[PDB]
Design a protein around this nucleic acid. Structure first.
Ligand SMILES: [Zn+2]
Lengths: 82, 50, 60, 119
RNA sequence: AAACUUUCAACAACGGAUCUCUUGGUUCUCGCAUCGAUGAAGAACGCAGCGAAAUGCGAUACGUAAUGUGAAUUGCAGAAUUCCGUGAAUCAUCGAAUCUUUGAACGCACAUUGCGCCCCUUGGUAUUCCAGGGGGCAUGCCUGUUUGAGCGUCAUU
RNA sequence: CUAUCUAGCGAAACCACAGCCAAGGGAACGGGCUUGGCAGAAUCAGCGGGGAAAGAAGACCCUGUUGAGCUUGACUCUAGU
RNA sequence: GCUUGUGACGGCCCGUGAAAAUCCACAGGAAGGAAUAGUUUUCAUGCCAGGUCGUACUGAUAACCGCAGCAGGUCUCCAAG
RNA sequence: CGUGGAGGUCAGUGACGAAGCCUAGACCGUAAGGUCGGGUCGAACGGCCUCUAGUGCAGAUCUUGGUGGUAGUAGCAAAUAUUCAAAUGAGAACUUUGAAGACUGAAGUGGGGAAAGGUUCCACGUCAACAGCAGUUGGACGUGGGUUAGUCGAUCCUAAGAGAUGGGGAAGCUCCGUUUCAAAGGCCUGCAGGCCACCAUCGAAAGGGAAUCCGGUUAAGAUUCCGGAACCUGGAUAUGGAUUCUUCACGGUAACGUAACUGAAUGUGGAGACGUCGGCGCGAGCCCUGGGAGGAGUUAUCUUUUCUUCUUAAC
RNA sequence: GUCGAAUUUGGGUAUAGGGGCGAAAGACUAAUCGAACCAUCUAGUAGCUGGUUCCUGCCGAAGUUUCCCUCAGGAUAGCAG
RNA sequence: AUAUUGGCGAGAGACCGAUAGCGAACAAGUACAGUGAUGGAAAGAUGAAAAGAACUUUGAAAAGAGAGUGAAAAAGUACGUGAAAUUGUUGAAAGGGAAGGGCAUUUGAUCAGACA
RNA sequence: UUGACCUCAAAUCAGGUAGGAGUACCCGCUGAACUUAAGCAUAUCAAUAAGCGGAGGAAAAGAAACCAACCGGGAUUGC
């Protein structure tokens, strides 16, 4: 009664996509993302979830701005050109 | 589902383009190791979860 | 029939067409294709030939 | 090859706009040809030519604005140095060297002297 | 006696052990101090001539400019308007720009590609409507500016 | 309709090695051991005695100086009032 | 006649069977109004525009969830003799 | 005895073949194990004195991987049922066409959709894999195509309800509250006038809700395309008509009536807006049926017969 | 069995873990409920069960005392090397 | 002066060597599962160079047989070596309800070792 | 009437700044239990892990309301 026939009553997504974490983790009735924590400004992180920390932390992506910073610092934050 | 978010449909086109085999000119590239796509998807077997 | 940017709309499209091609546009229909693009059907007035302008453009 | 910015930098805003318009026209025609034919990589060059043209135009306006705000107190935020946030705040050389007058007097009276130990 | 069962060798099979290898890991020591509202990290989407991804970039989209090297790239074709040149390359370097929609995220919202307001400009007879373009509209706190309320309160008409 | 025979397809549980019995003795009920009875390839369909058959590190029982739930004028505290 | 809608009635209740956007009317009497003319745009006619996103297909003994093209389960409209 | 590795040493072995593997061929050692020969193979390796240790497996219902007997066995058995012939192709129990029989029997194995799915829909090519047989076929594989809206929905409204702000608690992420002890603005006429105010916001693809129908069309789309005919909203506006010298209309006893016929703040009221059951009346569609006009079927015999077309949208 | 009411049901909404809901069975709370799921502390501890890798040689036991919330275990003496 | 598994740039090791060492030597926090938090893989090696097998033949084709390259195809994209379980063929041998094993020996098949 | 003052407000006022990330180390706050005790409640694990705030390149601390009782020393931090 509870298994194979009951599981056929499953068509009501309790989760949507976040704009922040991009995961199917945005709860609707609660309006929270249990991975990002949006729409809170704090990112959701927990020490005991270290695997999870490193699934998302810097390094995991593009680093659009940061990756060039060592170059700039090494140069000494130049101005002008040659 | 016949009345669907545009966000959703955006992702649909994404998956539609992501579901294909390799171009074969890659297999002739110097020092290749890629014989077949490992990330393909078929709606019958496995899902997207959107 | 044209492929169009997703940020477009009928007004912009109409405008740009008369601009680029020196045409009187009757009406426009749009859709977003499953391939993530904007297809744009564009009816002309009777004063013009879509065919003639097509091979003017060099697709035919 | 195509176009060169050192040839373009001697030109004006209007010539550059015309150049850009011509490039976009040509690009449109090339897109038409790209489906008439299997492959067409001449389109890359005009794509990069557009980029170079826009760069030069942006440079002209930006340097005009810079020479307009030459030696003014408030420059625009997109025109200040970026160095990094914590530095864009932190003290200046002036503020760092600001020193009270008591300390000035002690420094002048009794600065560290050069000395040596032999005899 | 065949077959069948069983053992042994060869050869062949299943399988990927062993050996050798290693653009990886780990550990130790040194040296340095640089995220972010001047909009980060992260996300989504899209970008190549021919790509799915990885990688890189953002409508200037495997990148633009400047500088250095000084003639490649390469799977195919295309180029070469050159090769004693301000000039190839997915080169390096990188100080100037672009930097989609988002994101602390900042007009308001956000399972919405949702609905408004201010300035300038352009078309439609248009201060009033529609549309396009361009630029703007968060909160708290500080410094100050201007306008202001209070029989709080002073002096005089 | 099955099982049965065929074309094609094509698993699983279980498996110390294995597979005829009696008596004895034995961890006091042996497929093997000792003494006897016996003993002929390969087998087919069923069959449900035995394999102390498989299923499951026994849920009863006892233990553990292992726990949990519940109760209470048990020990000790406690939010509250 | 069936399905359906609909109207007025009747019964039922210690149950009397959402809200707002939104549109309109009325009371009102601010205001402004004619003569060489002046007033009227809930009458008629006349001109222009009407954006964004979804739109295919299945909805089940093969497109959904049940590790699967699972005799399962999943809400609904039409419904002939 | 043996394994990995390090120091030292054999001016150690080696592509004329290193280690590695097989070898019912041999030799030494009580043994741990070592050596040699043959075959294979292709790049590093050993003996000795020392050092060092993640150091020797049959077990742990040990771990990962792989293979076996079981066994070509169990078994592929619900949903009434298939058959003939052609074409195709190498090949047809199963593809197509055609013909027969049969089913679901409209409470359908039909047609349409919401949720969900995501291109599966369609065309061509195509069978290595899946379709627990098959496979010329396919919801497969490969490549492409395809989803058109002022009128449908979303967009708006609010419901249960969530949730900022001012504030307050909280060490603190934060919690409470949403007529809050707030100095919470915008309505018309740079300014003078003047009136009002519990003012966030989100929350229904079934609730409320402005307006569109026809006929045709595609391989696949349509209230979205085409042809034609309408409607609504917003904004512009000008001609007509209407009204006035009694300036802001007339008729009707009245119910009321008209192609129009001023009317600010402000206030009142209404529609939005509403249960369920019963039966009765009315209409639409469908069902039955008559004549007549076409077409088809039966026609040894009978049957003025059986069936079918005779339709008219929104506005 | 019931089939027009304490009916059945979709969708939205509220209630969260010693907490929730409960026409009360300790039932339900995503196949999980006499205290969910995920991660961490955590390799928790375990007088208890299982396992514990090469040779040969030489030697060679104990299951007894005493005390223990001690009786499936320890210490101590004894046996052994 | 001190701390530092993070970030960046270096240099080293009596370390591990692809079931090891970071979970990841490769398109790995990827694929995939779960409503969700979270969980989380496996997967290295042709050759000096593709020279990746022209052409013929059989077949519908895959493929085979040839041929041919290459130092080698006992290196042919299922590719370094290529073990065992396990299986086929060949060969040898035995077999009355197990097999296997110790001592001893026949029989069979095979084998080293002595001299000028 | 005019002009001040005090207080509190507003403004898309001119210009500024805080948020979040990361978090090996650092300053704090809050804060357990398994465990050990052969039981167990104090005690221990632990002034730890988990949870929260906030920094830097180092932090923090630091120039004595000190250590001492010697014939006295003399900021802090670390071995
Ligand atoms: Zn999210």
């Amino acid at each position: 009664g509870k298994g194979t026939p009951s599981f056929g009553k499953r068509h009501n997504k309790s989760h949507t996509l976040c704009n922040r974490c991009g995961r199917r983790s945005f709860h609707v009735q609660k309006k929270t993302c249990s991975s990002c924590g949006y729409p809170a400004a704090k990112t959701r992180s927990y020490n005991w979830g270290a695997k999870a920390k490193r699934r998302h932390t810097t390094g995991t992506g593009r680093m659009r701005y940061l990756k060039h910073v060592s170059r700039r610092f090494k140069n000494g934050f130049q101005t002008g050109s040659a | 589902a016949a009345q669907k978010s545009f966000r959703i449909k955006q992702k649909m086109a994404k998956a539609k383009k992501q579901n294909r085999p390799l171009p074969q000119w890659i297999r002739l590239r110097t020092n290749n190791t890629i014989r077949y796509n490992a990330k393909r998807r078929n709606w019958r077997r496995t899902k997207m979860n959107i | 029939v044209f492929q169009v940017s997703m940020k477009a709309n009928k007004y912009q499209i109409k405008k740009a067409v008369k601009e680029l091609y020196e045409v009187d546009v009757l009406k426009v229909n749009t859709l977003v294709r499953p391939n993530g693009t904007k297809k744009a059907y564009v009816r002309l007035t009777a004063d013009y030939d879509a065919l003639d302008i097509a091979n003017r453009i060099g697709y035919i | 090859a195509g176009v060169k910015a050192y040839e373009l930098r001697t030109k004006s805003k209007e010539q550059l706009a015309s150049q850009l318009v011509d490039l976009k026209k040509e690009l449109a025609e090339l897109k038409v040809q790209k489906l008439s034919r299997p492959s067409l990589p001449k389109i890359k060059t005009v794509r990069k030519s557009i980029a170079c043209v826009l760069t030069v135009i942006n440079e002209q306006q930006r340097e005009a604005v810079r020479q307009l705000y030459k030696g003014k107190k408030y420059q625009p935020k997109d025109l200040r140095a970026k160095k990094t946030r914590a530095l864009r705040r932190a003290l200046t050389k002036f503020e760092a060297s600001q020193v009270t007058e008591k300390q000035r007097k002690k420094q002048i009276a009794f600065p560290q002297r050069k000395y040596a130990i032999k005899a």
